[PDB]
Write a protein that binds this ligand. Sequence first.
Ligand SMILES: CC(C)=CCC/C(C)=C/CC/C(C)=C/CC/C(C)=C/COP(=O)(O)OP(=O)(O)O
Length: 767
Amino acid sequence: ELDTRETSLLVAEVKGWLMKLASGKGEISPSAYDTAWVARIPSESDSSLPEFPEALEWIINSQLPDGSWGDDRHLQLYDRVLSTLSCLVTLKTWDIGHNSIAQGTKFLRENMIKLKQDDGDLLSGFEVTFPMMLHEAKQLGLDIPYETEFTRLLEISTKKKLAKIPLDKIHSAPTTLLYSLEGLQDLEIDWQKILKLQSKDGSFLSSPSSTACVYLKTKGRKSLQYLQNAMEDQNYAVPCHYPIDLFESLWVVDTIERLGIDVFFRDEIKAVLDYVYSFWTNEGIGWGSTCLVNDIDDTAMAFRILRMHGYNVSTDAFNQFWLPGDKFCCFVGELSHGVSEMLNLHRASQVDFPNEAILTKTFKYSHDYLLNVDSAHMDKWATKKNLMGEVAFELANPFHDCLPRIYNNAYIKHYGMDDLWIAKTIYRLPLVNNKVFLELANRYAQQCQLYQPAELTKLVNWWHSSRFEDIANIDMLPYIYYVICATFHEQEFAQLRVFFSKACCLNTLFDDLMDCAEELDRLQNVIEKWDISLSHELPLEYRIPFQEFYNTVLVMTEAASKIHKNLSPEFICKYLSGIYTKLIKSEIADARWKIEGYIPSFEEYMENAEVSISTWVHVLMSILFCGEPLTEEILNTIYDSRPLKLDRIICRLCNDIQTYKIEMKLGQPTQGVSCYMKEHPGATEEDALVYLQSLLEKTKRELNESYFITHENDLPKNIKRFNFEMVRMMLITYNETRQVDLNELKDMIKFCLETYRTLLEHHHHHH
Ligand SMILES: CC(C)=CCC/C(C)=C/CC/C(C)=C/CC/C(C)=C/COP(=O)(O)OP(=O)(O)O
């Protein structure tokens, strides 16, 4: 337990943070290096006085107890040495803070000799920023070491890299050197020309210190004003980049959604996404509302989250980052990029709509990159708690093959409540990384488990009293409960979770029985009539599931009639028996085609195989309990709606692709791969599967579009949601990477088996 307060207190606090973010106000730790840089500036009124005296007081009051400045909780020598240097140079320049200078130089005298290679993350621009700062300290005659094997090797290397940069490319187009111009002060820079590469707020890649250098080289008005306002907005201790209102708000929401605590924050999240959307363009976005360029990380992040929330955003935003070879950059003209942006690119590419081929290219490229990372070495200094864990999860879990609580429970183990971030120096994003998010995540995760014992206990009791043991393994039940718990986790969906579980069990039994039967006609006879009276003519193995199927329908009909007062019990019960008879007989059909010698068309086989796929019946039943109002027109048209068509197609294709070898290791002809082959001579099975795999991927894009966008005359929200999750519960069942892994599910299996034993012993205990 990480926080003591009531949930209501935590939730109110985060709501405050989110509404501040929805007005562009966030929280980034100050940068001692940047605060000291900007405080070099003298007032224009009186050049003998500082423009930012409060920043000089902050420097003096923020020195750490060992004489250094920098990140308090994670000591990194690069961060401490660079930050302390800057602070010393500025206190000395203004001839103040004699004691602080004394502590600072002493710290540097004990630790400069400790600087080495591969001792932490290269801070951004470190190669120029540290030698420059060191040289400025010497010009001031500070009493610190001025040469080590490390510092002279660094200066030699940097001088060679700088001597190879043609300087006019720095003034010609945006480069990452704009972030660290203070590291270039002594270079041959046409500072006047550099002014044309400022951001719309007068900053240079949003770096206060780099902006500060330009202002002292040029006295440009907009750059002073950017600093004056950043100083006043941040209370006179500025971060190393400002503002990052787009980056910070999207990462905070993303964190909230990946932890699965967005259930508490729906309105506030929408407010933040409206703020972000007011800055969305057809060329994406950068980290902030005044930044110079767009980047692929922010653009992928915003595209994915906005689209998932029903906003209209275009994949044209990704064209600017295309490179020959169907590769991508993070900023145009970059020389390399990192893993966070490919992770987010990879995630974004899977919410593609039809005819958005650029996202197939960004998917292939990011997937390929992510497959090739050096995992032994990725984030080896653990700025994040488990970045390589997030990569591995993302590679292994396709968006449509993953369920919400499965993703959330995995991220909860990855989430670092005290992660740090690397830029000019080390910084913190306490709104992204904090113990409050993780405590709320753990509490909601425990809420999702609370109802499971009782729900599982009723399911096992229903299994026993239905006499399924008298024909039949019960292991099927914890698994079915597991996936519906992961998709409809909110406690209010209990009737949905229980009825869905019963329905899936009943059909799994019937389908299994029929796939090993011919007097299916003796059965279709009874089922056609749906008459519990003619149950007695069934051969017992069909009698047990039939009578429980008939009973569960009545039970479902009573619960639904209590819920839906406008629907008559008779309408509901004709509907439920109708859908289950249609499914069952279609399952007899798929059976008698598998016994006789019939490989049909592809159109004909899949006309019956799409109804046979059983998936739509759980949609049609479950919507009775999904919390949405219903009408007869809805229940009469739902089977033919576009999202239900797509459901049936995707699940049939998936089944026929993923089981194909499991089918011919064993010689079975009636399947989509064969039926395709009987219609395209010269297609190998390799080409049939390729075609079916392509049709599957195309249908998934149609399902994305039908789902994330709210159309005119669209199905109610929770209904579209169930249909969406029904496809996913199907697909993950065939994601064989995940299946052999699968934890919670073993506990569910054990709980069910213990509950069964007690039932079978009639609670008499045996040794
Ligand atoms: C890892 C993250 C948070 C982002 C990468 C992609 C972008 C464009 C983020 C926007 C945040 C921002 C305002 C960044 C400016 C500072 C900066 C140059 C960060 C990149 O630092 P590193 O890539 O860790 O360091 P090096 O430049 O030393 O390789």
